[PDB]
Design a protein around this nucleic acid. Structure first.
Lengths: 80, 137, 164, 144, 171, 138, 54, 361, 290, 97, 256
RNA sequence: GUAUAUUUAAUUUUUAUAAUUAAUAAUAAUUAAUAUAAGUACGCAAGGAUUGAUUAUUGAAAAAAGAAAGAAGAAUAUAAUUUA
């Protein structure tokens, strides 16, 4: 085709989970904010395992509600 | 007859028989009345960020028997005029060509006035592949 | 024999120094008249004419391979062989033992450009050069070649009036 | 551009990067280096079970607290060095519908929050949710 | 006296090599053959190979005769699930060689499995069959062809009702 | 014999020299020559060796920075009629340089023009003698 | 310089440094625990085979 | 000589194909539906301790909803994300998948041509006689085994052997002197009996040339392989252990029949197409006799790139179909020639302006 | 017009074929010749090339033919073969450069292979309902595939029973038997027929004679001589049900002969129908047949 | 599936007066071709019958125009202007007349 | 750019012609009629075995001279096509009829009388013939000596030929020095007087008795050397006698 | 380190058709010249690198199914140059 700024500049290779948002303004890197504020410029483990995250308000206050032998919550089940 | 030569000699017909059994699965499913051919699911999970924070794409292509039959039977569309009139460029121009020359800022010696939209030399050297999300050149 | 227990060839260094083409039906040193890449670089003891105000008149080459195709990617040391005399200063104070670099100006062999041009000069021509790639002579008395237009021969280009 | 010197592509003495010229058999797809990590060969493609670490082909049946929640059982593939950089499979492709957001009213007009790096990361607005539905607002705690 | 022709069947000859299952020889008898199913899930590979070879070569029959090559077919399934005792999966070598000077191939059971597990099972069955009969090509080859290997649980021999093969370990 | 060197497959053993008459090679080559003439890389020429030998030729090689200008004779000509498979020999003689060069026609950069409508065989002979003496002395 | 071993399916033309990452150490599959060891591990842990009703 | 170290795509291992690595939202399979959460088994007894069966994860739901909303309402900004949900259709040319068949042509003659610069190319002109897709082949439908057999030149009935004539009769295609084969992809199929024009290629693309070398007969080592490791030895004088050579190793350059052989030039650029006379000029010289049936294929990659792409161009997939109005019999030979762009960048007699002492411009 | 069409007699006119519709691009030739004419040519000109051409035309025209036309085609084509012989064994030239001769089949074998492939494509991939609708065609195809040893292609290349060949089941990487090994000749068609039997409306439409012929065809096609277990069980069950339902009504010596043929077929397929045997032994109205 | 056997081993072109128009030439050629075809068909007195029987001619065609001529839009690398081409044509016509 | 194989390289005996640009060297003007290079390449005549190129040239001259003397000549091996091509070249020279062509043929051949005979008869004999003037039949009888294929090389248009008209060569005459057999229907033909006189003078030599003594001495020489079937010079008989002379004289008078 | 057997090279002569697997030539060729970046990073200063392009080093390669005692040329480069 032709030459383009899309070809010029490369985006950050960040996973969906890590990405805070897909907005055009948030497209850039996090360290960009610090670099702008300072007016200057400047690796997964072998077995990267994460335990599933939960909403902050629900996880910090989990009701002690149970059923026959399974914990029941508005968002999650479990076994106990 | 080497060990592996004998192994493959014995098993290649056996692998063909196993594949024949696998095909017979769908053949029964069709003779039952369900003429629709076996469908393979589409995999959305093909774009990844590897351990070194590098973009990776898995290319998955599915061959449609109906499309293959149509191609083998009917003529293809007439070739576009541009395709057969323009040549195949012998070079591959850079994704981010570097041009230090620019006539916008007075006294071009001043670096702090160069347009930012044009690439840097580091970008020109680094941009050997399409942008991250994109795969086709 | 060396190394003992597995003798090798003692010509390992000269193998790096020289460029040799396996003389097989698919690979040969042409006569220089068929196309680009055909010919043969000069050997060590080749004697050639040195055209300049320098007292030297004949120069024996030292490089195991000398040609125009790679006159800019290699250094051609050489030794003055038959120096002239006067009857009466650095240019005229050459000696038949001193060693200088040389810059090819022509080859008596058939030289083929990539453009299909073929040329046959009458004399193997060179000029003395200091280790800083600056010619000793004040000017030249022969025509250079297209290979002499490289930036590696800047002073030679400046002095040599006519190219080919 | 034209004033700069691009890399030779058609004719050159430099190594033309085509390792597949004398190492692959039969059809070779234009995708460069698709069968390179295998050892630069396209044989032994009939194997269904391969050497697998946790989270790979045959470990789908087994349970591992991480992959059991962070990887679909049907999404498992081949071993490490036998990774599937390119797959070709005959059949009718099936575009299964994408997931539909749940616990959202029908016809409700959400509120949009424009996240941007100009807002400091520590601010709770960054951790807020972009698309905000009226039915997601707890009105009995006073929240708007 | 007996005379085996120097003009043998060669792998490079268009006539090709035979399959002793479809051959008819004085020392081949498929009339008394049976069919067994061996599920090699969680069973040590050497033990599975030995157990399979015992039935494949016909040594499990009281009418066994070394000259006569008669044995029951064995369908080995779930070879992918075959187990090795410890670190043997990567610390056990498989060595072969070509006539070339370099020639030598040293590989791991892990590599053999990643290429084809049935190949590894075939290697161990070959080792057993060679351990017991090595002096004759026909004896070395025919039982191996009698053997059937499948890494998955799906095999096309359902039309033969292969009875499950039940055995016990030395322990 | 672990390798083979000869192929006996029909595709390779087959030759179409029998059917070559279906395509006119000479007409295609003459069309290429006429295309070169139209583009201007060369002009048509229909001369014999007797007619051309000894004729003066001016050569302008569009090298850089200064185009190379030479005047020489015609030692030989490959063909007597316009054709891509041509070529012409020249003996250029500068102040102290005697270079005999073969120049092919149709090259956009090597503008060679026979500046005279005729040549002299006596001139060719004496120029050839000069070249022979120079080559022997060299 | 080797005159043999050119079957890339078994002798890949890659360095030991490049193959080290692919050498498995915590080999999840194929498994290394035979079925005969299941009861032995059960007893070692000390559990009991209670009747189904219990 | 080789750059396999350059030739390596960004490595990845399937253990990393995790929800936290996916560039786009990670979707789970629940049968006929795609979900953001793992499938909760129907039998609750299969639940494991410390295992959470998620039914509504606010973080995933919000992030996915925002992603979908942005993709739907800002298509231009998020065009590159379209391929995630809208995969390219099959049967259309694909840059990394589509492989199209080639052609068979006779080596017509040799000539010399010149670039826009002063570069001379010793071109070989290959004639492409009546070419047609003679047959379609596939080994029981196995993926990747699709092959197209293309004819070379018409021929009388009496010319061929009885079995070749029978093969052509069974095919129904007009009898052809030569028939080559090309492995392709299903999308590249063309119906049997199709007519192939020289414009199937492009002036500046890259072609793989398979031909038969000229027969030089039985020649000695000086002619073939002519120029005129260690097994076991002790580096130090510590001990005495060695392994001498007890025979001739299989790889040993020795006198033999040098000549006829299927040679294959890889990635020769095309230089000129003359579709009126059905000729293709390649700027190279072959070690083959005139009349050899050369096979032209399309090089699929070069220097880590793909021959067909938007930057360079796209082919007449599957083949070139000439328009209806045009009539080659109504055109002259000079009106039907397509010259390639320059292969080199500068005048090879000189040096590039960067390396040149002075330039005229 | 552009020239003159030199006159010629009707006997010397080129007919029976039509070019493809898209001549300028697709210049293939199709055969519109009548099946009766093709069979007449096949029977009156026994030359190898004539038979090959007739078979090629038949293979081209299979999809355009009807059930009766296909029956006539197979009946005419099944002439040269015999039961005990080795079908499709057209060995003409003998090459013994290595030392053990191998015999290369002539052009007839590819003709029959292409005919079988065309029949498979027509009756499986294009018109799968035809086999179910017409039981006579189902029996004819099976009998043809039994007469020609489709599942024993090694016989196609074997020259003597003492040295059976393996050109159909051997394949080396260097290039041996690349063009004669692992042909799926009749595998797909046989699998489709087995599925049709296993899913029956076909047996409901069939006649007892047709069922006996079908079972015989299956046991003949199978290289071991015995039909698949499921197919044999299904056919035997259907035949027993029909015999029990129709014996109460009028019965004929032809029906008794059909029952005897079914019993013999079962014995040949190595099973034994105890009910049929007891019925035949008990019945005394009519004498038994051979 | 094949062409009819050879029907002509010698050829001879028939031209009319140069003043005849292209349409007239085409009409005459078509009329002659049709008459000869009818003569051959009836063969399977008049000039067509005499040609077919006595002379022996058994073929006639109307070949396409020889378009191999060059459209010289540039000579020696210099574009041929329309005015220059018309002037050259006029000069040649005047010299011929 | 240069080709892969550089320089004039010898190829297989039966190899194709490639138009790769290489410097071609020809020993001389091969287009000359009788000066043709011998080689196994397609552009050269086959080089039959000889002790040297000079010996090959001598053999070619002898073969052409014998062909002219008697149109028919039996030659063994690769020299048959060479003889046929040389005969065609001689016919071309005769048809050209230039004085330079005649002098060239005189240089080539051994017999000026045969040169004159060719330049006199071949023009009118092949005036209506375009290209091929000599035919080369292959004889199923191979030479017992070395088992080499034999070729009967003959001139065409014998009827138009004047001195060789009605000659049948199915079997040679009774004696090699007698006029060749004549077809029954062509028995009245009369040969040119000069050729007839030359043949008569040549035959008189053998008619002499000293030739009979030489023949007996040759019997003795071959017997001594080792040739087996050489009857003793006591048993041998003269080829020519008085009664045979008069019978052959009557036959010659009848044939005219 | 003075053609037998093994061994190796090649062949067993148009095979319509390379490649399911066996074996097998090229796992960083450095290096040299010039330019870009850049007269930048860095350095108290003089000074000043890392570094994927071009050139030089010029070659580029696939085993197994059809009919056989003349020259794979009716030989002078056309699978008939008219030819009697």
């Amino acid at each position: 085709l032709s030459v383009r700024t899309e070809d010029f500049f490369s985006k950050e290779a960040i996973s969906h989970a890590r990405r805070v948002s897909w907005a055009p303004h948030t497209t850039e890197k996090k360290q960009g904010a610090f670099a702008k504020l300072a007016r200057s410029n400047f690796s997964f483990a072998q077995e990267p395992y994460f335990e599933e995250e939960i909403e902050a308000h629900r996880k910090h206050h989990r009701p002690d509600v149970y059923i026959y032998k399974y914990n029941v919550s508005p968002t999650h089940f479990s076994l106990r | 007859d080497s060990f592996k030569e004998h192994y493959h000699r014995v098993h290649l017909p056996r692998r063909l028989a196993l594949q024949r059994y696998a095909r017979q699965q769908s053949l029964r499913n069709a003779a039952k009345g369900n003429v629709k051919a076996e469908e393979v699911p589409y995999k959305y999970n093909r774009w990844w960020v590897n351990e070194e924070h590098e973009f990776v794409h898995q290319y998955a292509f599915v061959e449609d028997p109906e499309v293959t039959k149509a191609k083998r039977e009917t003529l293809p569309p007439v070739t576009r005029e541009n395709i057969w009139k323009e040549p195949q460029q012998t070079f591959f121009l850079p994704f981010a060509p570097y041009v230090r020359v620019v006539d916008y800022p007075k006294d071009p010696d001043a670096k702090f006035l160069k347009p930012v939209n044009i690439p840097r030399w580091k970008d020109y050297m680094q941009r050997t592949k399409p942008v991250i999300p994109r795969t086709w050149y | 024999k060396l190394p003992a227990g597995k003798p090798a060839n003692k010509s390992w260094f000269r193998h790096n120094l020289i460029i040799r083409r396996k003389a097989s039906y698919r690979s040969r040193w042409g006569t220089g008249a068929e196309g680009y890449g055909t010919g043969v670089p000069f050997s060590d003891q080749v004697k050639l004419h040195c055209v300049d105000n320098t007292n030297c008149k004949h120069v024996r080459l030292i490089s195991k391979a000398t040609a125009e195709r790679f006159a800019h990617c290699r250094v051609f040391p050489a030794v003055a062989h038959r120096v002239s005399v006067q009857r009466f200063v650095s240019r005229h104070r050459v000696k038949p033992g001193n060693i200088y670099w040389v810059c090819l100006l022509s080859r008596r062999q058939t030289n083929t450009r990539m453009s299909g041009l073929r040329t046959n000069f009458d004399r193997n021509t060179c000029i003395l050069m200091n280790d800083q790639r600056v010619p000793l002579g004040t000017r030249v008395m022969y025509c250079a070649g297209r290979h002499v237009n490289h930036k590696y021969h800047l002073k030679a280009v400046v002095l040599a009036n006519f190219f080919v | 551009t034209v004033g700069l010197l691009p890399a030779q592509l058609a004719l050159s003495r430099k190594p033309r990067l085509r390792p597949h010229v004398g190492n692959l058999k039969g059809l070779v797809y234009p995708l460069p280096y698709y069968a390179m990590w295998r050892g630069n060969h396209n044989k032994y493609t009939y194997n269904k079970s391969t050497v697998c670490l946790w989270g790979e082909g045959d470990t789908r049946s087994m349970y591992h607290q991480h992959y059991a929640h962070a990887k679909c059982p049907t999404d498992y593939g081949r071993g490490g060095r036998e990774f599937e950089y390119l797959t070709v499979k005959r059949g009718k492709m099936l575009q299964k519908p994408l997931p539909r957001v749940q616990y959202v009213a029908e016809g409700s007009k959400p509120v949009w929050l424009f996240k941007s790096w100009h807002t400091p990361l520590s601010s709770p607005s960054m951790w807020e949710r972009e698309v905000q539905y009226a039915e997601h607002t707890p009105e009995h705690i006073g929240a708007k | 006296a007996p005379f085996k022709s120097v003009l043998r069947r060669h792998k490079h000859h268009p006539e090709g090599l035979p399959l002793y299952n479809d051959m008819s020889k004085q020392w081949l008898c498929r009339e008394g053959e049976r069919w067994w199913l061996l599920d090699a899930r969680g069973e040590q590979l050497p033990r599975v190979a030995a157990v399979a070879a015992q039935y494949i070569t016909g040594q499990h029959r009281p009418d066994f005769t070394p000259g006569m090559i008669t044995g029951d077919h064995v369908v080995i399934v779930n070879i992918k699930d075959v187990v090795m005792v410890g670190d043997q999966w990567i610390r056990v070598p498989i060595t072969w060689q070509t006539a070339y000077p370099g020639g030598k191939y040293r590989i791991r059971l892990t590599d053999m499995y990643e290429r084809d597990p049935c190949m590894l099972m075939w290697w161990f069955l070959k080792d057993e069959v060679n351990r017991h009969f090595v002096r004759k090509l026909k004896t070395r080859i025919a039982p191996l062809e009698k053997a059937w290997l499948y890494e998955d649980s799906i095999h096309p021999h359902a039309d033969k009702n292969p009875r499950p093969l039940c055995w016990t370990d030395p322990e | 014999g672990y390798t083979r060197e000869r192929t006996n497959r029909h595709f390779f053993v087959a030759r179409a020299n029998a059917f070559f008459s279906r395509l006119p090679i000479a007409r295609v080559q003459r069309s290429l020559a006429m295309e070169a003439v139209r583009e201007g890389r060369m002009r048509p020429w229909k001369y014999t060796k007797e007619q051309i030998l000894g004729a003066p030729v001016t050569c302008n090689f569009e090298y850089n920075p200064r185009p190379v200008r030479l005047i020489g004779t015609v030692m030989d000509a490959h063909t007597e009629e316009t054709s891509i498979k041509g070529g012409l020999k020249v003996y250029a003689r500068n102040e102290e340089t005697n270079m005999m060069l073969w120049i092919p026609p149709g090259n956009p950069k090597l503008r060679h023009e026979v500046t005279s409508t005729k040549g002299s065989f006596q001139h060719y002979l004496d120029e050839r003698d000069k070249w022979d003496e120079a080559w022997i002395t060299g | 310089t080797r005159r043999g071993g050119k079957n890339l399916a078994w002798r890949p033309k890659m360095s030991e440094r490049t193959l080290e990452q692919f050498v498995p150490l915590h080999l999840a599959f194929p498994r290394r625990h035979p079925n005969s060891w299941q009861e032995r591990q059960f007893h070692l842990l000390g559990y009991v085979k209670w009747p189904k009703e219990i | 000589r080789t750059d396999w170290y350059r030739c390596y795509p960004s490595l990845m291992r399937e253990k990393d194909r995790d929800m936290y690595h996916c560039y786009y939202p990670y979707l789970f399979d629940h049968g006929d539906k795609m979900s953001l959460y793992p499938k909760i088994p129907e039998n609750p007894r299969e639940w494991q301790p410390e295992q959470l069966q998620t039914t509504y994860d606010a973080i995933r739901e919000d992030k996915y909803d925002a992603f979908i909303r942005l993709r739907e309402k800002f298509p231009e900004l998020y065009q590159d994300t379209r391929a995630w949900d809208n995969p390219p259709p099959f049967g259309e040319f694909n840059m990394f998948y589509s492989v199209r068949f080639g052609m068979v042509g006779v080596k017509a003659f040799t000539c010399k041509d010149y670039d826009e610069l002063g570069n001379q190319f010793d071109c070989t002109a290959f004639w492409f006689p009546d070419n047609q897709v003679v047959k379609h082949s596939t080994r029981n439908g196995e993926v990747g085994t699709d092959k197209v057999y293309v004819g070379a030149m018409n021929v009388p009935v009496e010319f061929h052997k009885p079995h070749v004539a029978a093969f052509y009769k069974a095919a129904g295609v007009p009898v052809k002197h030569v028939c080559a084969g090309f492995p392709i992809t299903p999308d590249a199929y063309a119906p049997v009996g199709t007519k192939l024009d020289v414009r199937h290629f492009k002036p500046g693309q890259e072609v793989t040339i398979t031909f038969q070398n000229t027969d030089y007969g039985f020649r000695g080592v000086m002619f073939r392989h002519g120029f005129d490791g260690d097994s076991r030895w002790q580096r130090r004088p510590g001990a005495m252990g060695t392994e001498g050579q007890k025979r001739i190793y299989p790889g040993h350059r020795m006198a033999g029949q040098t000549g006829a052989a299927a040679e294959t030039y890889q990635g020769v650029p095309v230089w000129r197409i003359d579709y009126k006379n059905s000729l293709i000029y390649l700027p190279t010289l072959l070690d083959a006799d005139v009349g050899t049936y050369v096979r032209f294929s399309d090089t699929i990659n070069t220097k880590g790139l793909t021959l067909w792409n938007e930057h360079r161009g796209l082919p007449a997939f599957p083949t070139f179909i000439p328009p209806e109005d045009e009539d080659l019999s109504k055109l002259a030979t000079d009106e039907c020639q397509l010259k390639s762009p320059p292969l080199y960048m500068y005048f090879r007699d000189e040096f590039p302006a960067t390396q040149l002492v002075s330039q005229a411009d | 017009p552009s020239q003159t069409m030199s006159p010629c007699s009707h006997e010397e006119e080129m007919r029976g074929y039509v070019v493809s519709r898209d001549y300028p691009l697709i210049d293939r030739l199709h055969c519109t010749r009548s099946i009766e004419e093709l069979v007449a040519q096949f029977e009156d000109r026994p030359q190898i090339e004539s038979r090959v051409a007739a078979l090629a035309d038949m293979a081209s025209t299979v999809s355009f033919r009807s059930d009766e036309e296909l029956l006539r085609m197979f009946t005419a084509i099944s002439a040269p073969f015999s039961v005990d012989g080795r079908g499709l064994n057209f060995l003409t030239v003998k090459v013994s450069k290595f030392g053990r001769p191998y015999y290369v089949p002539n052009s007839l074998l590819p003709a029959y292979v292409n005919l079988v492939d065309a029949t498979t494509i027509a009756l499986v991939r294009e018109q799968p309902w035809r086999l179910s609708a017409s039981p006579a065609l189902f029996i004819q195809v099976l009998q043809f595939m039994a007469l020609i040893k489709v599942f024993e292609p090694n016989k196609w290349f074997t020259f003597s029973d003492h040295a059976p060949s393996n050109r159909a089941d051997y394949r080396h990487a260097i290039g041996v038997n690349h063009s004669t090994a692992f042909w799926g000749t009749g595998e797909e068609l046989y699998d489709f027929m087995v599925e049709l039997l296993r899913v029956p409306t076909m047996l409901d439409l069939c006649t007892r004679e047709q069922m006996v012929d079908l079972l015989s065809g299956f046991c003949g096609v199978m290289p071991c001589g015995k039909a698949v277990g499921d197919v044999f069980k299904t056919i035997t069950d259907a035949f027993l049900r029909r015999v029990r339902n129709d014996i109460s009504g009028p019965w004929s010596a032809h029906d008794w002969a059909i029952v005897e043929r079914m019993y013999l077929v079962t014995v040949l397929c190595d099973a034994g129908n105890n009910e049929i045997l007891q019925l035949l032994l008990s019945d005394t109205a009519s004498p038994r047949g051979p | 599936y094949a062409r009819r056997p050879i029907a002509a081993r010698t050829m001879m072109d028939v031209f009319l007066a140069e003043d005849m128009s292209l349409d007239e030439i085409v009409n005459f050629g078509r009329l002659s071709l049709g008459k000869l075809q009818i003569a051959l068909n009836n063969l399977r007195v008049e000039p067509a019958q005499l040609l077919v029987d006595r002379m022996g001619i058994s073929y006639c065609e109307i070949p396409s125009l020889d378009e191999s001529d060059y459209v010289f839009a540039e000579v020696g690398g210099v574009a041929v202007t329309d005015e220059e081409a018309e002037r050259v044509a006029q000069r040649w016509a005047e010299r011929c007349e | 750019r240069a080709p892969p194989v550089i320089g004039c390289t010898r190829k297989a005996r039966w190899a194709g012609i490639d138009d790769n640009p290489t410097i071609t060297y020809k020993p001389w003007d091969t287009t000359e009629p009788l000066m043709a290079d011998y080689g196994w390449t397609r552009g050269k005549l086959p080089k039959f075995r000889a002790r040297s190129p000079f010996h090959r040239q001598q053999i070619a001259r002898r073969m052409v001279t014998e062909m002219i003397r008697k149109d028919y000549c039996i030659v063994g091996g690769a020299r048959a096509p060479a003889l046929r091509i040389l005969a065609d070249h001689v016919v071309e020279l005769a048809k050209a009829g230039d004085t330079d062509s005649r002098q060239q043929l005189a240089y080539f051949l051994h017999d000026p009388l045969m040169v004159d005979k060719a330049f006199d008869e071949y023009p009118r004999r092949f005036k209506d013939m375009n290209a091929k003037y000599a035919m080369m039949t292959r004889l199923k009888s191979r030479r017992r000596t070395d088992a080499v294929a034999m070729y009967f090389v003959e001139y065409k248009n014998r009827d138009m030929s004047d001195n060789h008209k009605g000659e049948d060569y199915s079997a040679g005459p009774e004696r090699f020095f007698l006029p060749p057999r004549i077809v029954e229907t062509e028995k009245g033909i009369q040969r040119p007087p000069h050729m007839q006189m030359a043949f008569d003078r040549w035959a008189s030599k053998f008619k002499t008795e000293e030739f009979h003594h030489w023949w007996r001495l040759r019997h003795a020489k071959l017997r001594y050397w080792g040739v087996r079937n050489v009857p003793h010079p006591s048993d041998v008989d003269p080829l020519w006698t008085e009664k045979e002379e008069e019978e052959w004289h009557n036959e010659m008078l009848a044939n005219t």
